[PDB]
């Protein structure tokens, strides 16, 4: 099956070519050098952390 990892923070947001929202994910137990852009539809129960990002930007 496909692998899930704990999210510490949402640090940024962009639109891809296709128009889909991508989020820059800080992974819990890792630092910024390991942040990755993930499709919105890769995020599980991250609504509160998307709220926090939107409040900070």
């Amino acid at each position: 099956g496909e692998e899930l990892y704990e999210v510490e923070r949402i640090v940024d947001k962009r639109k891809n070519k296709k128009g889909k929202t991508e989020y820059l994910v800080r992974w819990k137990g890792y630092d910024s050098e390991d942040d990755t852009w993930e499709p919105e539809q890769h995020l599980v129960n991250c609504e509160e952390y998307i709220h926090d990002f939107n409040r900070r930007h």
């Binding site: 496909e2 990892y5 999210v7 993930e38 890769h42 995020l43 599980v44």
Partner: peptide, 5 residues
């Protein structure tokens, strides 16, 4: 959580 790809 997120799928990492």
């Amino acid at each position: 959580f997120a799928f990492k790809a």
